[PDB]
Amino acid sequence: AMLGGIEAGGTKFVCAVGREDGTIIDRIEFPTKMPDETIEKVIQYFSQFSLQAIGIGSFGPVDNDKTSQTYGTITATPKAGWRHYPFLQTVKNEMKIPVGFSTDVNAAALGEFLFGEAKGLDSCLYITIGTGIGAGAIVEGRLLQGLSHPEMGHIYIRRHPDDVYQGKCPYHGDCFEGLASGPAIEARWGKKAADLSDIAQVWELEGYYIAQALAQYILILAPKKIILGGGVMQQKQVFSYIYQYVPKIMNSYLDFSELSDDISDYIVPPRLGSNAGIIGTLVLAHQALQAEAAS
Ligand SMILES: [Pt+2]
Ligand SMILES: [Pt+2]
Ligand SMILES: [Zn+2]
Numbered sequence: 001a002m003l004g005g006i007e008a009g010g011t012k013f014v015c016a017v018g019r020e021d022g023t024i025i026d027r028i029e030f031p032t033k034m035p036d037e038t039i040e041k042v043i044q045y046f047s048q049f050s051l052q053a054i055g056i057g058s059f060g061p062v063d064n065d066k067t068s069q070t071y072g073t074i075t076a077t078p079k080a081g082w083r084h085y086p087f088l089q090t091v092k093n094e095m096k097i098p099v100g101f102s103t104d105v106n107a108a109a110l111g112e113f114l115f116g117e118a119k120g121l122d123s124c125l126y127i128t129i130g131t132g133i134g135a136g137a138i139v140e141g142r143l144l145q146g147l148s149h150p151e152m153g154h155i156y157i158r159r160h161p162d163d164v165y166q167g168k169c170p171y172h173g174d175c176f177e178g179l180a181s182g183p184a185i186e187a188r189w190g191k192k193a194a195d196l197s198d199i200a201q202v203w204e205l206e207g208y209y210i211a212q213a214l215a216q217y218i219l220i221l222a223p224k225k226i227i228l229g230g231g232v233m234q235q236k237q238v239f240s241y242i243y244q245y246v247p248k249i250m251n252s253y254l255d256f257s258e259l260s261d262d263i264s265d266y267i268v269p270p271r272l273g274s275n276a277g278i279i280g281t282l283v284l285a286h287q288a289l290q291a292e293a294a295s
Helices: 035-046 089-093 104-115 175-180 180-187 200-220 237-252 273-292
Strands: 005-010 012-018 024-031 052-058 097-101 124-129 133-138 226-229
Touching: 005 089, 005 104, 005 273, 012 035, 012 273, 024 035, 024 273, 035 089, 035 200, 052 089, 052 104, 052 273, 089 097, 097 104, 097 133, 104 124, 104 133, 104 226, 104 273, 133 175, 175 180, 175 200, 180 200, 200 226, 200 237, 226 273
Parallel strands: 005 052, 052 097, 124 226
Antiparallel strands: 005 012, 012 024, 124 133
């Protein structure tokens, strides 16, 4: 019972072979180039194995509406060739097995939901903070997919009055992603976020911005668990600032231990570490296998 997973990123692809229980048997990664050549490497890798199903967790925005004619395509990107490229259908045609599809952050949510910090809950929110900011949510045991998958990284948050930086986001300027991504931190402070590990106000400001976004998510979605991943969150100091700031912003408006005394157990790193996403693609594979077995 072997499953394939593809975590399709703007900078690299990770492909993996694994099991329904989240075990990774083998993996490979390679640079993301143009679609045809990138997907050829995927097919060449998976050809070694005899797979029952594949799951794709993709960068987006994507068309994640199963009834849509453009289901399983990337709908917006500055990356050459990728917009409107028949990603899902190409993998289906080449592999001729069930192929599940979702956003990359949705897959990471499913990973943590089945095997990580939200195991035993029926709700969670997984947020990645790195090159960009995105989130996937589980509601009553199911991925949140309304009119679109969410794009929680592009919400406006309150600018810190001392912060002068104009914002990295090509669409909004100073949305959450514009103010608080990896590339935003770098462009603001003039150094990459590792030379800055020692400057406390970088992570104070970052923690402040993340806390502002989290208060919004808590008031709108009220997830039962918030999982923070991505390269930025490797600066573990940011968590302590978030823990300080969230109760301050909400000012005792909602009385739950998750939001006050036990906040450090509510907003957490992924149990699966940097592998939540690729493991979640195996969950997507398994779901596609189950859904086809019940045709
Ligand atoms: Pt090309
Ligand atoms: Pt295959
Ligand atoms: Zn934006």
